[PDB]
């Protein structure tokens, strides 16, 4: 008779439409909560440095837990220890990049490599530029560009991040499931630096480019993507 | 059926309304506007009366046929693009026509037509150039203006009036419109000193002159 089946499938279509609408209001107010959280995280440390200076003391800030690592020297002639640590940091091509959270194992891993990388403490704007500009997802071990939120949600919904905003939130405020979030993101592929490197084969301290720029990776991401 | 209002969002920048979704809910007042709930003709024949069919089957089929296109969105046809000027071309401005058979001549811009093209008459009493369309880009626009706001160009002249037909003879309404527009352009430029000699004299580049260094 079909006058029941069409009504039922229209109810089903409308139901999943209302479901999608509720998910959109969800990730909207999650992004709002995150903006409130980043105002709080940015003003809290300024307020505490101010109270330390007005007491006359000092305030050593939180030693940073998130770095962005860019491969600076090329394939040819790598010492094999350094080649293996680069294969674990997923810097294979020249001028790739990867987020890395910091602990005692990871700092020694970066410092074995350190003539071949430039790694720094990225801003929230740097994490935004990298995720929206070049951020691709390793789905089914293929490299599908993160065009819409369903590509993030199907692969990391089990760790309760749905959209690109709580992806960026986990990576910036390094969360519990940072391992699988960062392993989800493909190794970033950046262009050659506009303007140019000052000197590749030396450390940043001695007027070069390799090594540990601390905050000054936020002047090099801006011109490498 | 009600008469449609204009948009209650003022455009802040393109694509962003100045009022949010809840404030626009309040301004549109949806809190009190909620709701809840051919092919055959029969023609007589003097027999019987035959059901004639419009839009019949095709008589022929080409032996293989191209498929349909994927359909995209922003690709509007030319008659409805948005049309832009430069900032330096306002009505009243003297232009330097750079490319036509009237190349190098100083003229008087009148109006942005409906199909993008500038309307030009450096009045043909002066430099022998009629009411002619001329493209925005192919023109150096110098900084010399006249007080053209108080003239009345004829309404009945557009791109469909200047569009080419198919020797070419000058029709009588062309020279009537020409006389009727330059007869109120040209006394307004005789009030400016040495301007009619300017519109006669042609732009050219000499030795030692360079367009990046010369301001006009």
């Amino acid at each position: 008779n079909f006058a029941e089946l069409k009504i039922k499938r229209l109810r089903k279509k409308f139901a999943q439409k209302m479901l999608r609408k509720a998910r959109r209001k969800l990730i909207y107010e999650k992004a709002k909560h995150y903006h409130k959280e980043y105002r709080q995280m940015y003003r809290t440390e300024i307020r505490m440095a101010r109270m330390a200076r007005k007491a006359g003391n000092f305030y050593v800030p939180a030693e940073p837990k998130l770095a962005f690592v860019i491969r600076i020297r090329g394939i040819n002639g790598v010492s094999p220890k350094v080649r293996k640590v680069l294969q674990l940091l997923r810097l294979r091509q020249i001028f790739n990049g990867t987020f890395v959270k910091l602990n005692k194992a990871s700092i020694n891993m970066l410092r074995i490599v350190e003539p071949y990388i430039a790694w720094g403490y990225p801003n929230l704007k740097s994490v935004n530029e990298l995720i929206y500009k070049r951020g691709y997802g390793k789905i089914n071990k293929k490299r599908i560009a993160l065009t819409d939120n369903t590509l993030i949600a199907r692969s990391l919904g089990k760790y309760n991040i749905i959209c690109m905003e709580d992806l960026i939130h986990e990576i910036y405020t390094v969360g519990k499931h940072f391992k699988e979030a960062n392993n989800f993101l493909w190794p970033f592929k950046l262009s050659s630096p506009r303007g140019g490197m000052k000197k590749k084969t030396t450390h940043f301290v001695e007027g070069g480019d390799a090594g540990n720029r601390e905050d000054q990776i936020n002047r090099l991401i801006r011109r490498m993507n | 059926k009600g008469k449609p209002h204009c948009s209650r969002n003022p455009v802040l920048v393109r694509g962003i309304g100045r009022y949010s979704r809840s404030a626009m809910y309040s301004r549109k007042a949806l809190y009190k506007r909620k709701y809840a709930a051919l092919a055959t003709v029969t023609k007589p024949v003097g027999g019987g009366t035959r059901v004639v069919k419009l839009r019949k089957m095709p008589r022929y089929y080409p032996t293989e046929d191209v498929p349909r296109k994927l359909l995209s969105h922003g690709k509007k046809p030319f008659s409805q693009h948005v049309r832009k000027l430069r900032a330096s071309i306002t009505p009243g401005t003297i232009l330097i026509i750079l490319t036509g058979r009237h190349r190098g001549k100083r003229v008087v811009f009148l109006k942005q037509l409906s199909s993008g093209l500038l309307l030009v008459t450096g009045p043909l009493s002066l430099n022998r150039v009629p009411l002619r369309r001329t493209h925005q880009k192919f023109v150096i626009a110098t900084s010399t203006k006249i007080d053209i706001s108080g003239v009345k160009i004829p309404k009945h002249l557009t791109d469909a009036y200047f569009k080419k037909k198919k020797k070419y003879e000058i029709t009588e309404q062309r020279k009537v419109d020409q006389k009727a527009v330059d007869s109120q352009i040209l006394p307004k430029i005789k009030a400016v000193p040495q301007l009619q000699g300017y519109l006669r004299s042609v732009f050219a580049l000499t030795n030692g002159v360079y367009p990046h260094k010369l301001v006009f």
Binding site: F14, A15, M18, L19, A22, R23, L26 | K34, Y35, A36
Partner: peptide
């Protein structure tokens, strides 16, 4: 609300309330 099998009655209620 926004996760499916436990938000069915809430999305149903907002559907009955949208009218």
């Amino acid at each position: 609300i926004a996760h499916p099998k436990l938000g069915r009655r809430a999305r149903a209620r907002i559907a009955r309330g949208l009218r």
